[PDB]
Amino acid sequence: FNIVGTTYPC
Amino acid sequence: FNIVGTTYPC
Amino acid sequence: FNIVGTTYPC
């Protein structure tokens, strides 16, 4: 879980 | 790479 | 939309 948005690797 | 078949986790 | 569950084709 992270409160900062992430990029999707799939 | 592996010569033995693997299961897919996605 | 359908109230009866469906199978996934992808």
Place this chain on the structure above:
Amino acid sequence: FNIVGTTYPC
């Protein structure tokens, strides 16, 4: 099948 490239909708 098409010889002209297509965009992906999924």
Place this chain on the structure above:
Amino acid sequence: SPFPLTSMDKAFITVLEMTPVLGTEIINYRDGMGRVLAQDVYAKDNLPPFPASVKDGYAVRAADGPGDRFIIGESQAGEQPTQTVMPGQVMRVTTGAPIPCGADAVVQVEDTELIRESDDGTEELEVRILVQARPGQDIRPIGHDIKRGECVLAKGTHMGPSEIGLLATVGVTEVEVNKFPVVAVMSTGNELLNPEDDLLPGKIRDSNRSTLLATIQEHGYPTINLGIVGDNPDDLLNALNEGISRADVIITSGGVSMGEKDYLKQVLDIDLHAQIHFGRVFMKPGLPTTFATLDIDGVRKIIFALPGNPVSAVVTCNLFVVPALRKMQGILDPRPTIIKARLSCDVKLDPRPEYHRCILTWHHQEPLPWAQSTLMSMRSANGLLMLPPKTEQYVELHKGEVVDVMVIGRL
């Protein structure tokens, strides 16, 4: 004569087609959560109603360009300034303060350096403007956000906190909305005791009344507790008449199968003169689910006679009752949200469409949540798995396969 088995699709569309939309009432805006607007809402003022600074800094003439400027005063939040900025002058401004006459841009304090203040250090006198402002920079003109006469919310809007804030913004403190349904719930059965009771021989506690009332309350609708009614037609008719008087919707559970003292369908038809639209549904669970309407003096009452088995009662309440209540309170598309999830376990398919409470969980960088059928003990069900009927093709579904899940819980 048993009622015909109604398909799940026909039973569902019958409930939505036959359910009425309630009338309207005026409410205070602060009571608007979950309500649907029955009127368009218009702004009677501009937002902002004066030209407003975007920044803490200085109101300048852009044409003056960069350089050393006399500070003629301050525009503070809540005060209309009296002074006019002339070429060579600026006025201090804070975010949201009005732009004085003669200024056409704001320079943020970070693009300035203070030269001279008062000996008290209380007033700024001269500032160096380090940038060339574009005319209009860091100003919200009058009506930038909302124009006087603009429709800010349309009829049919299902309101949440941001819509309540917008009503506050425009000063529309009273709004026309659809009424919420009042929902009366009764349990049936000579075997039932209240939750507060110690057991007696042959008896069990009534759970369905609690579970159904809580399900309806969770959605924000007012409820009426009609208690436990015995397995006899006179008492059932009296209790239905009380429900019809006090509520828009009556929910019963039990007494709808073909057992000797299952009496509800006879009472609804013969004694109450309601129209039973379906009395059996080809679904698992929920075979004896019954839906009726009763038209009195141009008011349509809604009656759901749910199955007695507690799992059946809560599943059918989620499939049929909640969407009906959403249509009654004015929601334009009252259907539930259906998402795709991955099955956590293999499942054998039934010839009937099958439904089961589950918990949806999103895992790290996986696009689809997993559906786990009822630390997972610490979470309430938030989904109803919707399994397809078995066919010659599909007899079973496997772990990881993609299924439909109806949202019944906040995720």
Place this chain on the structure above:
Amino acid sequence: SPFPLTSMDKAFITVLEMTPVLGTEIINYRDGMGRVLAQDVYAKDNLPPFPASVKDGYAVRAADGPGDRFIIGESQAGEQPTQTVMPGQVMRVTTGAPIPCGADAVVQVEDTELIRESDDGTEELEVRILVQARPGQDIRPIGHDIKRGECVLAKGTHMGPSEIGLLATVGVTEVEVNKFPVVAVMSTGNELLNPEDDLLPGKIRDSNRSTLLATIQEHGYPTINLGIVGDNPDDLLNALNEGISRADVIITSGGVSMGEKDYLKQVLDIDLHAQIHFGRVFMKPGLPTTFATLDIDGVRKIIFALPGNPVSAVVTCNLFVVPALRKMQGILDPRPTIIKARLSCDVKLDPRPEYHRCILTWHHQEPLPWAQSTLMSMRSANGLLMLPPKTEQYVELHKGEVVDVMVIGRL
């Protein structure tokens, strides 16, 4: 001296680490929705408490096999039978009725044919049993579902309707839970008018109080309206003291940037003697977001001084306040649900992590919902898009690319 820019990750973990869990209270079970159990709950009775029929039909001796049987009476719901079934005999049973002594299986009425009834047609006398029952068939033995002494709900369970039903089932009508936070909300600014007011020169209506109170109420917490406070330290201190007295949590908005009459951080630190854990956050929107704790007589008060800009106020309320309130009311993992969605539009990334209200929509047989940033007008925001900070690699995201969305609405 401006406060240091705190990373979004550090600010979030600081709020959850520093927020207390409230104490416990006993409530009536019917008030349990959204509450967290602070005790394990045990069954004091078996469910079922007698051996119970699964079906409408007949209680038989399996060893008798199929054939023609004397019906010695009926076991009806709610009555303990008095008769013993002897070889060659059966008793009529309904679903949920007790199994008489001497019977060890139930045959459902569909696996029977009636031969002889009374001339009145009121009593069945002889039935043909068409099947070989397996011993135990269509009976729920005593304690099948719940055993006396079994823990049915663990401490830490976040209760919904099915948990309320289970408490009714076991007759545990009073339960220990965590308290809910009482949340006081004030707005700040010399420019603000009440929603009920007509505009005056230089002024606007207060929207944040309405939007923040509605956000908190939506989550089921009690609130206190502390009104509008002017931009002056004495009034702000008086209003904070009132919040501290009446509430567990104080939310302010406005007055937290570096403007001349932005006073909240000075009052919290110098006048109220609270510990400011962060006063700026590297996030968009929400740069001046401020979190403080105040320890009085072994009670920790929580203070969130949110930014004045209305969009900033509601976004930061959803990111920081709601998770804090979930920890205070006892939820073990109070973090919000994060799902994956597809962007409906290209977006330029900021160096700060960026957040924007959106509507999540699931399309036909598409695994991922689409996120559309704020007929879509008829739906309230149910997501907060969580955009990643720009890097040398990623400067922009495109339509269809997969993003994190925090659930803030029922889907």
